UniProtKB/Swiss-Prot annotation:
GTP binds at residues 10-18, 29-35, 59-60, 116-119. InterPro entries: P-loop_NTPase, Small_GTP-bd, Small_GTPase, Small_GTPase_Ras-type. PROSITE patterns: RAS. CDD domains: H_N_K_Ras_like. One of its GO terms (molecular function) is G protein activity. This is GTPase KRas. A motif (Effector region) lies at residues 32-40. It is linked to Leukemia, acute myelogenous: A subtype of acute leukemia, a cancer of the white blood cells. AML is a malignant disease of bone marrow characterized by maturational arrest of hematopoietic precursors at an early stage of development. Clonal expansion of myeloid blasts occurs in bone marrow, blood, and other tissue. Myelogenous leukemias develop from changes in cells that normally produce neutrophils, basophils, eosinophils and monocytes. Leukemia, juvenile myelomonocytic: An aggressive pediatric myelodysplastic syndrome/myeloproliferative disorder characterized by malignant transformation in the hematopoietic stem cell compartment with proliferation of differentiated progeny. Patients have splenomegaly, enlarged lymph nodes, rashes, and hemorrhages. Changing residue 14 to I: In NS3; affects activity and impairs responsiveness to GTPase activating proteins; characterized by a strong increase of both intrinsic and guanine nucleotide exchanged factor-catalyzed nucleotide exchange leading to an increased level of the activated state. One of its GO terms (cellular component) is membrane. It is found in: Cell membrane; Endomembrane system; Cytoplasm, Cytosol.
Amino acid sequence: MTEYKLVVVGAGGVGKSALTIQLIQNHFVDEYDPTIEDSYRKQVVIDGETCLLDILDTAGQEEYSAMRDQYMRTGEGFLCVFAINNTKSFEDIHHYREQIKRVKDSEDVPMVLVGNKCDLPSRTVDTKQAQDLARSYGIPFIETSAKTRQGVDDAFYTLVREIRKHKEKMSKDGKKKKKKSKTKCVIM
């Protein structure tokens, strides 16, 4: 069993609590709050592989938290919650993605671009914007809806698979590899 550590960051007020609370519970509906801080730990079996999916549901009340930084370092994958009908939502995601990848290493950090409220006919972000973000990190992108309760299903399982793949590429890459150990000079 491998603990697949998840953390939800970026785009707040969009309905982060609804997606996470509902996905874990599926008992209460029509829940909507500005931002609810309450971590949830739910294990899920993927492709016959038992793993722990802990969705770190937190609020942006204070960016200065030792625990917040602590979780980001220990996290394995990030959920990119955004509203396709809002520029700010995906724009906010980009800022967080750049900081997270910067802090940890670079465009090699596990995460999947997953939005909500796709049913609403008011898209402000085209394929190329979501595509640009996903292609930048070399990972797939998708849109979902809490109302539909379907896209989050694919997004959650897909995220897990990409995380596993990161381990695959990283393992094959090993501690080091590059093209040449030696060095050369362009000179004139």
